[PDB]
Amino acid sequence: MSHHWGYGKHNGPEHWHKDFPIAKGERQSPVDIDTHTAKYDPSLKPLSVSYDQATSLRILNNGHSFKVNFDDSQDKAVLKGGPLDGTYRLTQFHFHWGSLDGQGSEHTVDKKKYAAELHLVHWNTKYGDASKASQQPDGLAVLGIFLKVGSAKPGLQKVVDVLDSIKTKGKSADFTNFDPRGLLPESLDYWTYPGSLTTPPLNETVTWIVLKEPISVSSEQVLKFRKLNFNGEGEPEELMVDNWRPAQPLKNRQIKASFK
Ligand SMILES: NS(=O)(=O)c1ccc(CN(Cc2cccc(OCC(=O)O)c2)S(=O)(=O)c2cccnc2)cc1
Ligand SMILES: NS(=O)(=O)c1ccc(CN(Cc2cccc(OCC(=O)O)c2)S(=O)(=O)c2cccnc2)cc1
Ligand SMILES: [Zn+2]
């Protein structure tokens, strides 16, 4: 009720704890991934990203990011294996990005920030709906993918080309027949750890799976992200940039690697 959090000096991550006290919890995300500390875990099962029957629906500017939602009324696009027990259904993806190419990711790798980070958000079907799942310690799984600026990502272009139609907060557009497989890198090598949502309400209910291999996107593609607005239509223009939470304390957690 009456959410006024954001990313600016006056409502940004340093303020969130006053309305969402779990912001100072033991299981917060994102984190810095120390690649030297992370240990290879031979017990991790193979990771299964099964998106061939994904049904995208709409794309929306929610004033924080832009989000593509999926039909998750049946097992159509699911994530299994790796650190996960059972089946997690894809519900939405969104991005976090920066004002400059050297910042924008939420996770960091040996303190390196990437230009942006893609989050593919899934819920554990044992809890029946995403609302219930969002409140369970093993309820959600987010697949995080770094974006670096270099060559264009062809599977991103359809996203880039619709953003002019959802410039301001509250705008949505049809976004059917989008294949999220076009957003993945070649390798599914990953790091995993238990964490949280990276925006309010910051629930500590996420298994994070962060792919090691970034995707390359073009400077032109990420420039289009930076033309979005945080504000609504006929409010003063504030560019939607730097919509990322910085790294939070690791506390008593181990980051596991799927690879040697
Ligand atoms: N959840 S939280 O703990 O992080 C939290 C909750 C409330 C606030 C307070 N703000 C009041 C306000 C009142 C009317 C509209 C608002 O939003 C506008 C906008 O989106 O910019 C914000 S504020 O300091 O006036 C403000 C205005 C504009 C930009 N940053 C901050 C700060 C932090
Ligand atoms: N950056 S991140 O990847 O860590 C991330 C991912 C997802 C979210 C959104 N929440 C969780 C959620 C994930 C999917 C579906 C959900 O619907 C049920 C619900 O209302 O909880 C919930 S949420 O704040 O609970 C929410 C969702 C939709 C509308 N309003 C609230 C925030 C941050
Ligand atoms: Zn996110």
**CA torsion 135→1→250→93, rounded to 10°?**
70
List strand residue ranges (DSSP E) for 4-102, in order: 32-33, 39-40, 47-50, 56-61, 66-70, 78-81, 88-97
Contacts of 54 (CB under 8 A, 6+ apart): 70, 76, 77, 90, 178, 179, 180, 181
Domain at 3-260: CATH architecture: Roll (3.10)
Residue 64 annotated as catalytic = yes
Containing 41, the helix (H) or strand (E) segment is none
How far, in Å, CA of 143 to CA of 192, rounded?
9
| Spatial distance between the Cα atoms of 104 and 152, rounded to a whole number of angstroms | 18
- Would you tell me how many other CB atoms lie within 10 Å of the CB of residue 111? 9
Strands 47-50 and 140-149: unpaired
Ligand-binding site membership of 96 (annotated): yes
Q: How far apart are CA 238 and CA 215, in angstroms?
A: 28
Report the alpha-carbon distance of residue 240 to residue 97 in Å, rounded: 9
Peptide bond into 201 cis (omega under 30): yes
Task: State the resolution, in angstroms.
Answer: 1.1
Amino acid at 45: K
- The C-alpha atoms of residue 182 and residue 9 are separated, in whole angstroms, by 35
Among residues 3, 15, 64, 107, the one annotated as catalytic is 64
8 Å CB contact between 126 and 139: no
Q: How far is the CA of 190 from the centre of ligand 1 (A)?
A: 36
Q: Which ligand 1 atom sits nearest the alpha carbon of residue 9?
A: 30
Q: What whole-number distance in Å separates Cα of residue 221 and Cα of residue 160?
A: 6
Output the CA–CA distances (angstroms, integers) from residue 253 to 28, 29, 202, in the order listed. Answer: 10, 11, 17
Report the separation in Å between the CA atom of 11 and the middle of ligand 1, taken as the mean of its atom positions.
Answer: 5
Domain ranges of the chain: 3-260
Residue in the block written with tokens 């907060």? 169
Residue 96 near residue 116, CB atoms below 8 Å: yes
For every residue of 137-156, DSSP letters joined together read TTSEEEEEEEEEESS--GGG
- 118 Cα–ligand 3 center, Å: 7
CA–CA gap between residue 113 and residue 210 (Å, rounded)? 14
Residue 248 CA to residue 260 CA, distance in Å, equals 26
Task: Give the span between the Cα atoms of 77 and 55, in whole angstroms.
Answer: 8
Identify the DSSP state of 75. S
SS3 200: coil
